[PDB]
Amino acid sequence: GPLGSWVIPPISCPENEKGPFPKNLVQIKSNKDKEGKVFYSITGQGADTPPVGVFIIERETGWLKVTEPLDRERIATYTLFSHAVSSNGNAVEDPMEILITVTD
Template identity: 40%
Template sequence: MGWSVNFDDCHGNENVNFEVSHPAFIVDEDGSVVPLRDVTDSGSTLFIHGRTAFADDMVEIKIHGAPERRPQTLKEILGLGQSPAFMRTKRSLLAPPMFVPENQRAPFPKSIGKVISSEMPDNVVFKLTGEGADQEPKGIFYINKNTGEVLVSRSLDRERIAFYHVSTFSIWTREGM
């Protein structure tokens, strides 16, 4: 399987910086999308972000026939709880980088990722903080407090705000609180 991306900033494409939403891929100097290792967990979508001093663009690549990723708990990812030797573990939170293409079309809201906790979902409440969440412009990003699913509520205008830095945190609750 071979993919390539074409990027044209109308100024000679000098110093193009590409970012790929999956860490197992890079974009070569000729625009070829290259896997760094055997990839079995790419999911069904990759985002490639190209940027120079003159242009900034993102492409979404749909991978047809890719196996669906089975949702995993953080305990499964880290291999915790598989042995009685692990009687007590620290709580962990996994929030992977989330990429949102510019000028997406309706319908909204759109899911852009999921935060995973090592605790049981009914013991955790997820929250977002930062520009676009609880800081101006408020309400662009929000999180399902019970499932950890992160959503974008409208199209993004990168000319107005180039980057959003949103952080997530969780509150562990006890029954009866």
């Protein structure tokens, strides 16, 4: 079902964080990586829809990063999706909805 082989912790980031940017939040992982090479990507709010590129993911390592300080009063949550595709061009997981909460 939806979980598949995803391993993801809850994601929260304090607003007004100190640099240096970009900052690593969590390392998104799919255990389909035990069967072959997997490539990670993210879509949605703060990734490929406005504000674009607030969150980025490192394709091979799964490191989810934040590129700039956040402001809770401006955007308090971001609804992103993580994707995992094999080296033979196929999705190895169903995309996972990740809610990033901006805290104090």
